[PDB]
């Protein structure tokens, strides 16, 4: 039987490619992987199907893109999505995204079309070893950038909810730490991004504790129509 010549996967946050069906898998085949949202109330997700062996989007081949829409609005990381890749015996590729609680789904089918040459396939395979270490470093960088954005999004939500728990003075220390994280996350030093996240965490520890204290006093001792 025939096999898939290159890995098939999906773009994930940070410009990275997650492999769903590995290179050299016999066809027909189907494999799934599970994913979630990045922001509070997210109702859509972009499903960008790629082909190749390397870690960054710019180093793989873009096959197709579509969106899953109608995701129920839930806190960041709360909606559960499964994406399934199917390649039939004739090489037809179907990709389906579906959300757990409502079953909402979107799918495409992509006809086999103008191939890769055997020599371009070989070259993409060989580049993946030749740039393996650079790619490991690039993925680590990008994953730290995603973590930075994750921390910033969570702070952004907490400020939206609970700005009233901070003085303008305390709020400026936080805003300055968050602006500085946001700046260094634009560069290419992984250790610096890590230290800036740690600084945001330390500057928000009291805020996070006042938010818990508030939920606990309220649940346990009760609410006041005052505030």
């Amino acid at each position: 039987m025939d096999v898939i010549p290159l890995s098939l996967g999906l773009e994930t946050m940070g410009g990275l490619v997650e492999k769903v069906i590995p290179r050299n898998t016999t066809i027909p085949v189907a494999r799934a992987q599970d994913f979630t949202t990045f922001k509070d109330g997210q109702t859509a997700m972009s499903i960008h199907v790629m082909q190749g062996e390397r870690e960054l989007v710019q180093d793989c081949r873009s096959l197709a893109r579509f969106a899953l829409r109608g995701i129920p609005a839930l806190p960041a990381g709360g909606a559960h999505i499964r994406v399934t890749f199917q390649v039939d015996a004739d090489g037809l590729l179907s990709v389906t995204a579906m959300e757990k609680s409502t079953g909402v789904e979107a799918s495409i089918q992509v006809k086999p079309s103008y191939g890769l040459t055997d020599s371009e396939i070989a070259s993409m395979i060989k580049d993946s070893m030749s740039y393996a270490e650079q790619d490991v470093k690039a993925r680590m960088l990008a994953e730290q950038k995603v973590e930075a954005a994750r921390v910033l999004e969570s702070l952004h939500g907490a400020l939206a909810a609970d700005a009233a728990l901070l003085s303008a003075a305390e709020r400026q220390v936080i805003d300055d730490a968050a602006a500085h994280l946001s700046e260094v996350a634009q560069g290419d030093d992984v250790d610096a991004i890590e230290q800036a996240i740690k600084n945001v965490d330390k500057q928000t520890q009291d805020f996070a504790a006042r938010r818990m204290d508030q939920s606990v006093r309220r649940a346990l001792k009760g609410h006041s129509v005052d505030e």
Partner: peptide, 9 residues
């Protein structure tokens, strides 16, 4: 629209 985030390891 945002791409997916891995839901686990």
């Amino acid at each position: 629209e945002l791409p997916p985030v891995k839901i686990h390891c």
